[PDB]
């Protein structure tokens, strides 16, 4: 007789998917949900490299960062994982890790002199250089601050004020010296105890030196606790001190804000990034989720340890 | 039903008729159709309402008591684990649901043809039905669109059916 049969479709696609029970099921059709393409390491916007210097080295003015000098705008700054130049005179940076988040949001700054090094009064600005922060063979100090010491055996109470007439946020940095012994304090500041009073429209702190002889790092037994703040447009901040003071000399006017984050790798500067730029690279392929790197930039597919995420769309391909 | 049809490229589910006029494939498009809308909606909900990958956490002060970020570090790592599991599992779940769904649609199309034909045809080992009567292209299309007329052919099918057994 005549025959009418019911049947399904078979193709040639062998892309296989895995199910909650059976696996490697050859389906007629399937989507790859996991973005696992060739990382593949002008164009759009161009990035910058912190070279042998760290973010601290890139902002503190570590003498050897004189190479870094010249990078005002960028798309994605590049830091080495263990740079040679961090904090040559041993110490810490208060809130460095939210300032790096701030710079995850900064694409261009303008560095300018907020306080002249010689305009701090009858105080020695031409001194205050260390071998830990030596520039070349010659010794030196951080370029964005000045290490003021006594003039003619007296270090008076100095006071200056900066008014952000720029109309934009200004990143300002300074620090307090924590000498190793009392004699270092007396030799540099010609008194036994000192203070640093920082007061802005909103900021308010009084710091005092903590004198103790920490183990030697780069040959120094003393420390320095550096601090940073954002002077908002219209704010007039005032610095007052009679010792143990790393004067601000240069500040950064945030010129442009956006979403340029940072990483710690050593690949060549890579521009023309896609929606998601990763350390390995930036692939245009837009599968819902990716798995190249956990540390990503821009709107990014979620990192997942998976190696295959193929969603079954067609039916079980079984030809003949 | 053992195997699929590379020749039926009209949809996932359908028919292969073979009569006096000849033999041909032709997909059942209402069912194919409902399956496509269903799997499309499933995929859309999976992709769109997937999860909030963006770390909306403000992290105003992050952690930082320990040298490296301590709490948000392991929080993010644990969230990574949470979906790394959920997504693998959801893929599996929905893929076997899709295969069981395709299987159910096939089963249902077959049962519809069976309920139409009843006595006027014989069931065959695999997916196929052999008529006890001559089913031209009009009769074939009547079966497909669901308008098969049993009393029309019931007498012819009766005579043939009772003849094959001597």
């Amino acid at each position, epitope marked *: 007789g005549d025959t009418l049969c019911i049947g399904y*479709h078979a193709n040639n696609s062998t892309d296989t998917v895995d199910t909650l029970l059976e696996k490697n099921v050859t389906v007629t*059709h399937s*989507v*790859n949900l996991l973005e696992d393409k060739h990382n593949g390491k002008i164009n759009g916007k161009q990035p910058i490299s912190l070279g042998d210097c760290s973010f601290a080295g890139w902002i503190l003015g570590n003498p050897m960062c004189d190479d870094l000098i010249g990078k005002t705008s960028w798309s994605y700054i590049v830091e080495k994982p263990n740079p040679t130049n961090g904090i040559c005179y041993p110490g810490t940076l208060e809130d460095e890790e939210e300032l790096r988040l701030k710079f995850s949001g900064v694409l261009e700054f303008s560095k300018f002199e907020a306080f002249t090094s010689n305009g701090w009064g009858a105080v020695n600005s031409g001194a205050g250089v260390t071998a830990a922060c030596k520039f070349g063979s010659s010794n030196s100090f951080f370029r964005n601050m000045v290490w003021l010491i006594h003039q003619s055996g007296t270090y008076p109470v100095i006071k200056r004020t900066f008014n952000n007439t720029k109309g934009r946020d200004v990143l300002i940095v300074w620090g307090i010296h924590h000498p190793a012994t009392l004699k270092e304090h007396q030799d540099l500041y010609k008194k036994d105890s000192s203070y640093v009073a920082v007061g802005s429209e909103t900021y308010n702190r009084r710091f005092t030196p903590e004198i103790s002889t920490r183990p030697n790092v780069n040959g120094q037994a003393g420390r320095m606790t550096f601090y940073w703040t954002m002077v908002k447009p219209g704010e007039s901040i005032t610095f007052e001190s009679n010792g143990a003071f790393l004067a601000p000399r240069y500040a950064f006017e945030i010129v442009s804000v956006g979403n340029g984050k940072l990483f710690r790798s050593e690949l060549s500067i890579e521009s023309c990034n896609t*929606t998601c730029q990763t350390p390995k690279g930036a692939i245009n392929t*837009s599968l819902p989720f990716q798995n190249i790197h956990p540390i990503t930039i821009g709107k990014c597919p979620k990192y997942v340890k998976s190696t295959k995420l193929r969603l079954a*769309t*067609g039916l079980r391909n079984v030809p003949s | 039903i053992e195997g699929g049809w590379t020749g039926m*490229v*009209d*949809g996932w589910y359908g028919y292969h008729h073979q009569n006096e006029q000849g033999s041909g494939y*032709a*997909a059942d*498009l209402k069912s*194919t*159709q409902n399956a*496509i*809308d269903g*799997i*499309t*909606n499933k*995929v*859309n*909900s999976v*992709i*769109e309402k997937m999860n909030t990958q963006f770390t909306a956490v403000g992290k105003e002060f992050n952690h930082l008591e320990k040298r490296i970020e301590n709490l948000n570090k392991k929080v993010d790592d644990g969230f990574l684990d949470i979906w790394t599991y959920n997504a693998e599992l959801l893929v599996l779940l929905e893929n076997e649901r899709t295969l069981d769904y395709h299987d159910s649609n096939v089963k249902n199309l077959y049962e519809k043809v069976r309920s139409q034909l009843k006595n006027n045809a014989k069931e065959i080992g695999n997916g196929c039905f052999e008529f006890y009567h001559k089913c031209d292209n009009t009769c074939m299309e009547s079966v497909k669109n669901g308008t098969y007329d049993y009393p029309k052919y019931s007498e012819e099918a009766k005579l043939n059916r009772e003849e094959i057994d001597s």
Partner: antibody
Amino acid sequence: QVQLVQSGAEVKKPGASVKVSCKASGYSFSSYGISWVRQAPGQGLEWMGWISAYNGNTNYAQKLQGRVTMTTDTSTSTAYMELRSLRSDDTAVFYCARDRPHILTGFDFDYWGQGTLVTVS
Amino acid sequence: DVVMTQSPVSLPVTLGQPASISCRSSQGLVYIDGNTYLNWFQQRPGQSPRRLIYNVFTRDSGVPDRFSGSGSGTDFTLKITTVEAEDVGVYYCMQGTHWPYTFGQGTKLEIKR
């Protein structure tokens, strides 16, 4: 190459059947499909309907269901739209376009038609 | 059913000033093939329409590099650098993967704002 020739302009009264034709040349008829869209004066409407040369099959727009009948002549590679029960609101400029014939493939509107004015009053 | 909302119905664009057109969908427009489906197309007054973008990121062979199609998920855009003269016209969203597929409303361009 790109040759999608619609029918001539047509003028009728409400309640009469209308028939539009779209010719096509080249190797572009590989039993591929053809869809038709509506464009009301000044503002376009959504798709009207589609048909597959490979597998006789038609998808019609909603609330037109009952008036729209579409055909294909594979021998002349020609598609046909036929709207019954004409309305004054139906007065509009129609259009043809390419489409892929089996559902295993999706859709592609690579060509377009010369346009056919249809007036109903 | 699908709803294609186009927020920028009217667009006065100074020649040479890249502008964008936004299509927003009610549901997601991905498909079994894995390819999101919206194919932008343009129409000139008294001239039959012609498409420009294939899926979300393919340019029609006959499309200048100015016409760039973007978008992901449910919200999608179309930006044209240095908008030229013939670029003026009416634009439309495209088929949602759901058979009731919706062109949406229209968006018009101007020579120089």
